[PDB]
Structure formats: structure tokens, C-alpha cells
């Protein structure tokens, strides 16, 4: 949601009185402070502190460049950085921010109109921009909301269908009277004054005009007072709440960073009749490897379908069976054939010809650990957090599908691109028979469960957060087993935020029953991730180009 949602002292959209109340009840001490959302400005806040037993409310606007600042004060990249700053320097206020009035018990910020407005746009943005639906849309959103908002805040209004770049009041008027004179028909036209446009809309068969003024901060204003960062937000806002408007806005009067939804993010089946076994004649295989591992080798190739030719990855040699146990293998495959989720390497089908081949979705970016080695200066942490979050989305999926992985590890997290990771080889592990990814009970009692995987995710997090470093480097066999029992876990990676190491730690509880399940893991990894996805950027083609 809000880039202040993680802040333990942020209360969301509470009133000025509610605010004072929480402070009153906290000790009215000098330095007591809380943060909240400005009911009148989109993306803005209000710093509320106590000094000499009296309340002080400072509004915090969001400049057109993304920083936050109290009028006359310094600019800050975010609520977090702002509060961290004034805590060590009054720089204008009655006194430094000292004891924070953290939210009581288990209360969360009070979601308001801007939070609701924000989701709606993102939602209708992906649905719109990539015609996605169902969980697929839900999966796109949950993971890319951070990136989608940025897009929404940079999309030019000149783009929107309701904007008319060269219209006069008289014309717009006759353009609105020219057709379906329905309540809510509207358009926007820029007025002469720099940063001024007019909202022209129909109500009761009559056209109404509303000046839209732009202030010094650039924020767009409605006669009523509410401010927005762009017209589009203002428009969607008036679409729900119609303050100052004679009627809610309705129908319109018409006239770099690779995201995850390009290429097969969605299942290959978008009109089916898919069988488990494929025809070797529909499969084109190369004799050139993409690497190999414990099981067979991986070769690239293409697969032709009734209407499409897709690119695949063939893991030649699954292993092959010697007895009527080729049925058991086929049992698993049957199940895997069902698993469908963007963050997982889907199984297209199996084919038995010169060998027992496993055909999967193409994920050519390579393993997560190879992609991160030596790139600590290239790939920002927020970017790694994003991948670890995608990794838990597939894991939470696989867990609710009662399908244990058994081999979660970096080597098994495959990248489609910089911001798209897929989990692979989920199942082939249990086909036959450096492996410090297993939980203690996997080695101690042959026990495998989603809880067992949550441990491997813990290890994977480490592998990634420490940019491709081998787990428990100075060890191998039992040395680890021992190391574990003695209550020792791996150290917190350099430049790895506390919340992650905290999550990672909970992932390494010896009693699997105490370890979080992926549902909880995924919630936590998201909150962490979202908050990290604010601090601008670092390295490569990020001129926001
Ligand atoms: N679906 C795929 N698309 C593209 N490359 C793949 C795919 N699956 C595997 N690879 C490549 O093969 C390598 C991984 O080898 P693989 O045979 O999958 O096992 P591994 O991760 O080395 N170990 P393990 O699964 O534990 O036996 C990676 O470096 C990938 O580049
Ligand atoms: Mg693998």
C-alpha cells in the first residue's frame, strides 16, 4: 500500500482528534510523535508531535519529483527517511523526534479513500494494460504493485481519452451536447494559464465547468481543495467521491524496466486439449545444452501446438524406470501437470522417444545465484527482495496445492528477466536416489513438508541476500548438522536489512512446527519488499529511461 505502511508509528487515515488521543494516551511526553495520512492531499502526511505538553501538527506534501518535505524544510526521499532525519536534528521543529507513539496491540493503518483509489487504479491498470484476469491478475498485482504505481504516476494525461489538447469552453460545451447527454459525461481541456485546465461535464442535460488549478508544488487542485499528483488520479478520484461536483464523473467524451507480464507469464493453455504425453514430432530439440545437473541435461527446443509454436526447455533423461514403477513417476507428473502459477516453471508435458524427456517453460535467465555473483553494486537489494517475494508466491501456491518441493534452492530459482523469477524442478527430486538446503528433519526422519521447504527458502534467501555466496562455506557434511543442533545459524549477510534476516531466522527454527508456513512467509516477504520498493534505484539502465 503506502510507503509508510511498515513504519510501526504510522496510523493511516485517522482524524486529528484520534491522532491526539493516541498521543495523549502515550504519555504526552516531549518528543512523542506519530505519522498519518493527509485527508486532503494524495500521498501526503501529517507529522504530529508533542512538546511542552501541547500538540503540533506538521503537514507533509509530496513534490512532483517524489520526495517529501514539510513546508520550508528539507526534501526527503520518503516518510522513513524523513522521520529518521528530524529524530537527530530539530531543523525547524520544536524539538527532535524522540519516543514514537507506535500502534497499539495489533492495529494496522486505517485504509482510506486514497488507499482504495490507489488499488483500483493498479487493478484496472494491469487488467487493462495486459488484459489479465483471475488469480493471474491477482498474481500480477501482488507482485508488481510497486512498479505499476510508478507507471501510473508517469503516464501522461495527454494520453487519456478524456483529455482534449486544444478545445475551447464553447466547443467542449457543444461537444458534450453532441450525443449521449448522460449524467457524468466529461472531458478535460487545458485553460490558458500555465498549469490550469477545466473539467467540463454533463448533468441534467446541462454542461458544468470546474477550474482545475495547479499550485507551486505542481499538485492539481479541485475547487474543493483536495490535491493530486496527476490529473488521472484526480479523475479517478472524482469517479468515486464527487466533492464540489454537481455529479460524480462517469463516461468519457472521447476524441526500460521489463515487467513480468511480457512473454509466457500466463499458462501456455489459453484454449485447451492438453495431454500428459506429447508427440515427439511436435517437439524440435537442439543438441546444444543450456547447462546440466544432478538429473539429466537441459536442452532448448520448440513445441508446436494446434495454433501456436512455443519455446521450451527439455530436461533430457528424467531418469527412466526399470519395472512397473514407471506408473508411479507418471502419477507425480500427472499432478505437476496441473500446477499453474506465473512464479513456477510449468510442465508442458512429457515425451518418450529416444529418451524420457521432460518438457517445461523456457526460463533462460539462468539460476538466481549465478545471476547475482559479484553484482552487489549492479542489482539493488530492492530488486533481490522482489525476486525472493516472487519465490514465495509460487511457494505459497505450491503449499496450498499440497505439493512439497524438496529442492528449493537458488540453483533452482530460474530467471526469465531482471524482475521475474520462476521456481523449477519441483517434484523430480523425489524420483530416485553440496546439499545444505535440507531442513534437519529431512535428514533426521525422512520428513518432507511445506514446513520442510520453508527452511530451504530460508537458505535461499541467504544465498541471494549475500549475492551468490555458498551456504556454510567453511563446512560440508555433518559439520553443518552439528552446527545446527548447537543453535547456530548463518550470520546476517552484509547490507541485508534486519526484517529479512529476521524472517530468514524464523525460517530456521529447529522445531518445524514453530516455523512459519508460506502463507505467513509470503505476507512478511511482501511487506518487506513493498517498503524496500521506494528508495529510487541503483545501477544499470535506470534513468527511469
Ligand atoms: N526451464 C529451463 N529453461 C532454461 N534453462 C533451464 C531450465 N531448466 C534448467 N535450466 C538450466 O540448467 C541449469 C540447472 O540445471 P538443472 O539440470 O536444472 O539442475 P541444477 O539446478 O544444477 N541442480 P538439481 O536440480 O539440484 O539437480 C541452470 O543453470 C539453467 O540455466
Ligand atoms: Mg535445477
Short mmCIF file of N, CA and C in Angstrom, two decimals, residues 159-240:
data_model
loop_
_atom_site.label_atom_id
_atom_site.label_comp_id
_atom_site.label_asym_id
_atom_site.label_seq_id
_atom_site.Cartn_x
_atom_site.Cartn_y
_atom_site.Cartn_z
N UNK A 159 -2.36 11.33 -22.77
CA UNK A 159 -2.68 10.00 -23.27
C UNK A 159 -4.17 9.67 -23.11
N UNK A 160 -4.68 9.83 -21.88
CA UNK A 160 -6.08 9.54 -21.55
C UNK A 160 -7.07 10.05 -22.60
N UNK A 161 -8.11 9.25 -22.89
CA UNK A 161 -9.15 9.57 -23.88
C UNK A 161 -10.03 10.77 -23.58
N UNK A 162 -10.07 11.17 -22.32
CA UNK A 162 -10.91 12.30 -21.93
C UNK A 162 -10.24 13.65 -22.07
N UNK A 163 -8.94 13.65 -22.33
CA UNK A 163 -8.21 14.89 -22.48
C UNK A 163 -8.32 15.41 -23.91
N UNK A 164 -8.62 16.69 -24.06
CA UNK A 164 -8.71 17.29 -25.39
C UNK A 164 -7.77 18.49 -25.40
N UNK A 165 -6.59 18.26 -25.97
CA UNK A 165 -5.48 19.23 -26.07
C UNK A 165 -5.68 20.60 -26.70
N UNK A 166 -6.81 20.84 -27.35
CA UNK A 166 -6.99 22.15 -27.95
C UNK A 166 -8.47 22.47 -28.13
N UNK A 167 -9.18 22.52 -27.01
CA UNK A 167 -10.62 22.77 -27.03
C UNK A 167 -10.98 24.04 -26.27
N UNK A 168 -12.05 24.71 -26.70
CA UNK A 168 -12.49 25.92 -26.01
C UNK A 168 -13.74 25.57 -25.22
N UNK A 169 -14.07 26.42 -24.25
CA UNK A 169 -15.23 26.24 -23.40
C UNK A 169 -16.48 26.08 -24.26
N UNK A 170 -16.59 26.92 -25.29
CA UNK A 170 -17.73 26.91 -26.21
C UNK A 170 -17.78 25.60 -26.99
N UNK A 171 -16.61 25.12 -27.38
CA UNK A 171 -16.54 23.88 -28.15
C UNK A 171 -16.85 22.67 -27.29
N UNK A 172 -16.12 22.52 -26.18
CA UNK A 172 -16.35 21.41 -25.27
C UNK A 172 -17.84 21.35 -24.97
N UNK A 173 -18.43 22.52 -24.80
CA UNK A 173 -19.83 22.65 -24.49
C UNK A 173 -20.65 21.99 -25.59
N UNK A 174 -20.36 22.35 -26.84
CA UNK A 174 -21.10 21.79 -27.96
C UNK A 174 -20.69 20.34 -28.24
N UNK A 175 -19.53 19.94 -27.74
CA UNK A 175 -19.04 18.58 -27.93
C UNK A 175 -19.72 17.64 -26.93
N UNK A 176 -20.19 18.23 -25.83
CA UNK A 176 -20.88 17.46 -24.81
C UNK A 176 -22.36 17.38 -25.14
N UNK A 177 -22.87 18.40 -25.82
CA UNK A 177 -24.28 18.39 -26.21
C UNK A 177 -24.48 17.54 -27.46
N UNK A 178 -23.37 17.06 -28.03
CA UNK A 178 -23.39 16.27 -29.26
C UNK A 178 -23.46 14.75 -29.17
N UNK A 179 -24.46 14.23 -28.49
CA UNK A 179 -24.56 12.79 -28.42
C UNK A 179 -25.31 12.36 -27.20
N UNK A 180 -24.78 11.34 -26.53
CA UNK A 180 -25.41 10.84 -25.33
C UNK A 180 -25.26 11.85 -24.18
N UNK A 181 -26.25 12.71 -24.03
CA UNK A 181 -26.26 13.72 -22.97
C UNK A 181 -26.65 13.07 -21.65
N UNK A 182 -25.78 12.18 -21.21
CA UNK A 182 -25.94 11.41 -19.99
C UNK A 182 -25.22 12.03 -18.80
N UNK A 183 -25.82 11.93 -17.62
CA UNK A 183 -25.24 12.48 -16.39
C UNK A 183 -23.83 11.94 -16.12
N UNK A 184 -22.83 12.81 -16.10
CA UNK A 184 -21.48 12.36 -15.81
C UNK A 184 -20.52 12.37 -16.97
N UNK A 185 -21.03 12.64 -18.17
CA UNK A 185 -20.19 12.72 -19.37
C UNK A 185 -19.21 13.86 -19.10
N UNK A 186 -17.93 13.63 -19.35
CA UNK A 186 -16.97 14.66 -19.03
C UNK A 186 -15.74 14.57 -19.90
N UNK A 187 -14.96 15.65 -19.86
CA UNK A 187 -13.71 15.76 -20.57
C UNK A 187 -12.87 16.81 -19.83
N UNK A 188 -11.60 16.91 -20.20
CA UNK A 188 -10.72 17.91 -19.61
C UNK A 188 -10.06 18.65 -20.75
N UNK A 189 -9.85 19.94 -20.55
CA UNK A 189 -9.20 20.77 -21.55
C UNK A 189 -8.32 21.71 -20.77
N UNK A 190 -7.14 22.00 -21.30
CA UNK A 190 -6.25 22.91 -20.59
C UNK A 190 -6.67 24.35 -20.85
N UNK A 191 -6.71 25.17 -19.81
CA UNK A 191 -7.07 26.58 -19.96
C UNK A 191 -5.78 27.31 -20.28
N UNK A 192 -5.87 28.60 -20.61
CA UNK A 192 -4.68 29.36 -20.95
C UNK A 192 -3.60 29.44 -19.86
N UNK A 193 -3.98 29.82 -18.64
CA UNK A 193 -3.00 29.92 -17.55
C UNK A 193 -2.15 28.64 -17.45
N UNK A 194 -0.83 28.80 -17.32
CA UNK A 194 0.05 27.64 -17.19
C UNK A 194 -0.50 26.81 -16.05
N UNK A 195 -0.49 25.49 -16.23
CA UNK A 195 -0.97 24.60 -15.18
C UNK A 195 -2.42 24.78 -14.77
N UNK A 196 -3.28 25.06 -15.74
CA UNK A 196 -4.70 25.20 -15.46
C UNK A 196 -5.50 24.54 -16.56
N UNK A 197 -6.49 23.76 -16.14
CA UNK A 197 -7.35 23.07 -17.06
C UNK A 197 -8.75 23.19 -16.49
N UNK A 198 -9.72 22.79 -17.29
CA UNK A 198 -11.11 22.84 -16.88
C UNK A 198 -11.74 21.46 -17.01
N UNK A 199 -12.59 21.12 -16.05
CA UNK A 199 -13.32 19.86 -16.06
C UNK A 199 -14.70 20.27 -16.58
N UNK A 200 -15.09 19.74 -17.73
CA UNK A 200 -16.40 20.08 -18.28
C UNK A 200 -17.26 18.82 -18.26
N UNK A 201 -18.40 18.86 -17.59
CA UNK A 201 -19.22 17.66 -17.52
C UNK A 201 -20.71 17.92 -17.66
N UNK A 202 -21.43 16.86 -18.01
CA UNK A 202 -22.87 16.94 -18.20
C UNK A 202 -23.63 16.41 -16.99
N UNK A 203 -24.67 17.14 -16.61
CA UNK A 203 -25.57 16.77 -15.53
C UNK A 203 -26.90 17.42 -15.86
N UNK A 204 -27.99 16.66 -15.72
CA UNK A 204 -29.30 17.20 -16.02
C UNK A 204 -29.34 17.90 -17.37
N UNK A 205 -28.72 17.29 -18.39
CA UNK A 205 -28.72 17.87 -19.73
C UNK A 205 -28.01 19.22 -19.80
N UNK A 206 -27.26 19.56 -18.76
CA UNK A 206 -26.55 20.83 -18.75
C UNK A 206 -25.05 20.68 -18.48
N UNK A 207 -24.24 21.44 -19.21
CA UNK A 207 -22.78 21.41 -19.05
C UNK A 207 -22.28 22.26 -17.89
N UNK A 208 -21.36 21.70 -17.12
CA UNK A 208 -20.80 22.40 -15.99
C UNK A 208 -19.29 22.49 -16.15
N UNK A 209 -18.72 23.57 -15.64
CA UNK A 209 -17.29 23.78 -15.76
C UNK A 209 -16.63 23.92 -14.39
N UNK A 210 -15.52 23.22 -14.20
CA UNK A 210 -14.80 23.29 -12.95
C UNK A 210 -13.32 23.54 -13.19
N UNK A 211 -12.85 24.69 -12.73
CA UNK A 211 -11.45 25.06 -12.87
C UNK A 211 -10.58 24.08 -12.12
N UNK A 212 -9.47 23.70 -12.74
CA UNK A 212 -8.52 22.83 -12.09
C UNK A 212 -7.24 23.66 -12.06
N UNK A 213 -6.86 24.05 -10.85
CA UNK A 213 -5.69 24.88 -10.65
C UNK A 213 -4.51 24.03 -10.24
N UNK A 214 -3.32 24.49 -10.62
CA UNK A 214 -2.08 23.82 -10.29
C UNK A 214 -1.30 24.79 -9.44
N UNK A 215 -0.88 24.35 -8.26
CA UNK A 215 -0.13 25.22 -7.37
C UNK A 215 1.39 25.16 -7.57
N UNK A 216 2.11 25.74 -6.62
CA UNK A 216 3.56 25.79 -6.67
C UNK A 216 4.16 24.41 -6.63
N UNK A 217 3.61 23.55 -5.78
CA UNK A 217 4.10 22.18 -5.66
C UNK A 217 3.73 21.39 -6.92
N UNK A 218 2.97 22.01 -7.81
CA UNK A 218 2.58 21.33 -9.03
C UNK A 218 1.31 20.51 -8.87
N UNK A 219 0.99 20.14 -7.63
CA UNK A 219 -0.21 19.35 -7.34
C UNK A 219 -1.49 19.94 -7.94
N UNK A 220 -2.30 19.10 -8.60
CA UNK A 220 -3.54 19.55 -9.22
C UNK A 220 -4.64 19.69 -8.19
N UNK A 221 -5.37 20.80 -8.27
CA UNK A 221 -6.42 21.11 -7.31
C UNK A 221 -7.82 21.28 -7.88
N UNK A 222 -8.78 20.82 -7.09
CA UNK A 222 -10.19 20.90 -7.42
C UNK A 222 -10.73 22.09 -6.61
N UNK A 223 -11.70 22.83 -7.15
CA UNK A 223 -12.25 23.98 -6.41
C UNK A 223 -12.43 23.67 -4.94
N UNK A 224 -12.70 22.40 -4.65
CA UNK A 224 -12.93 21.94 -3.29
C UNK A 224 -11.71 21.96 -2.36
N UNK A 225 -10.52 21.74 -2.90
CA UNK A 225 -9.34 21.77 -2.06
C UNK A 225 -8.40 20.57 -2.12
N UNK A 226 -8.95 19.40 -2.41
CA UNK A 226 -8.15 18.19 -2.49
C UNK A 226 -7.12 18.32 -3.62
N UNK A 227 -5.91 17.81 -3.37
CA UNK A 227 -4.80 17.85 -4.33
C UNK A 227 -4.34 16.47 -4.80
N UNK A 228 -3.89 16.40 -6.05
CA UNK A 228 -3.43 15.14 -6.64
C UNK A 228 -2.11 15.34 -7.38
N UNK A 229 -1.38 14.26 -7.60
CA UNK A 229 -0.10 14.35 -8.29
C UNK A 229 -0.27 14.45 -9.81
N UNK A 230 -1.37 13.89 -10.33
CA UNK A 230 -1.66 13.93 -11.77
C UNK A 230 -3.17 14.03 -11.97
N UNK A 231 -3.57 14.43 -13.17
CA UNK A 231 -4.98 14.56 -13.48
C UNK A 231 -5.73 13.23 -13.38
N UNK A 232 -5.12 12.17 -13.90
CA UNK A 232 -5.71 10.85 -13.91
C UNK A 232 -6.21 10.40 -12.54
N UNK A 233 -5.40 10.65 -11.52
CA UNK A 233 -5.75 10.27 -10.16
C UNK A 233 -6.95 11.11 -9.73
N UNK A 234 -6.87 12.39 -10.07
CA UNK A 234 -7.91 13.36 -9.75
C UNK A 234 -9.21 12.87 -10.42
N UNK A 235 -9.08 12.47 -11.68
CA UNK A 235 -10.23 11.97 -12.41
C UNK A 235 -10.80 10.70 -11.78
N UNK A 236 -9.95 9.74 -11.45
CA UNK A 236 -10.47 8.52 -10.86
C UNK A 236 -11.07 8.83 -9.50
N UNK A 237 -10.46 9.79 -8.82
CA UNK A 237 -10.96 10.18 -7.51
C UNK A 237 -12.38 10.72 -7.66
N UNK A 238 -12.58 11.64 -8.59
CA UNK A 238 -13.91 12.21 -8.80
C UNK A 238 -14.90 11.18 -9.33
N UNK A 239 -14.35 10.06 -9.78
CA UNK A 239 -15.14 8.95 -10.30
C UNK A 239 -15.90 8.28 -9.12
N UNK A 240 -15.31 8.35 -7.92
CA UNK A 240 -15.91 7.77 -6.71
C UNK A 240 -16.51 8.82 -5.79
#
